[PDB]
Structures are given as structure tokens and as C-alpha cells.
Design a protein around this ligand. Structure first.
Ligand SMILES: O=C1c2ccccc2C(=O)c2cc(S(=O)(=O)O)ccc21
Ligand SMILES: [Zn+2]
Length: 30
């Protein structure tokens, strides 16, 4: 299940395996 997620900081789709964003490092809940 690669239900990737969209950061709420830089708006970049990051993989699901990645708990943190791969641009600003901000967690999905931060
Ligand atoms: O090439 C990538 C890509 C391409 C098209 C859509 C999404 C991604 C992606 O999330 C990604 C993350 C990462 S990671 O370092 O966050 O795992 C590396 C590469 C990609
Ligand atoms: Zn981000």
C-alpha cells in the first residue's frame, strides 16, 4: 500500500514509507 501523502507545509507528495517529508523534513502531523 503506497498510499503516499501530501505534506501540509510544502505541498509535495511524499511516500507512505516516509514518516517525514522529503523536502522540509516536517512530519505529517507537524
Ligand atoms: O522519485 C520520487 C517520486 C516520484 C514521483 C512521485 C513521488 C515520488 C516520491 O515521493 C519520492 C520520495 C523519495 S524519498 O527519499 O522520500 O524516499 C525519493 C524519490 C521519490
Ligand atoms: Zn514538506
Amino acid at each position: 500500500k503506497f498510499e503516499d501523502w501530501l505534506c501540509n507545509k510544502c505541498c509535495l507528495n511524499n511516500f507512505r514509507k516516509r514518516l517525514k517529508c522529503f523536502r522540509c523534513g516536517a512530519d505529517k502531523f507537524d
